[PDB]
C-alpha cells in the first residue's frame, strides 16, 4: 500500500 | 493538492 | 483512488 | 477550481 | 466523477 | 461562469 | 452536466 | 445574458 | 436548454 | 429586446 | 426570469 | 393561448 | 409549460 | 442558480 | 425537471 | 458546490 | 440526482 | 474534502 | 457513493 | 490522514 500527500 | 491510495 | 483538488 | 476522483 | 467551477 | 459534472 | 451563466 | 443547462 | 435575454 | 427559450 | 406557456 | 415573460 | 431561471 | 422546466 | 447549482 | 438534477 | 463537493 | 454521489 | 479525505 | 470510500 502506498500513500501519498502532496 | 493530490491524495493517492494504492 | 486519487483526489485532486486544484 | 476542479476536483476530480477517480 | 470531476467537478469544475470557472 | 461555468459549472460541470461528468 | 454543464451550467453556464454568461 | 445567456444561461444553458446541457 | 437555453435561456437567452439581451 | 429579445427573450428565447430553446 | 419566467416564461410561461399555455 | 397566452405567453408571459417576466 | 414554464420554464424559470433565478 | 435554478432552472426549472414543467 | 429542475437543475440547480448552489 | 451542490449539484442537483431531478 | 445530487452531487456535492464539500 | 467529502465528494458526494447519489 | 461517498468519498471522503481528512 | 483517513480516505474513506463507500
Same mark, same amino acid.
Given at each position: /500500500?502506498? /500513500?501519498? /500527500?502532496?
Amino acid at each position: /500500500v502506498a /500513500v501519498h /500527500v502532496f
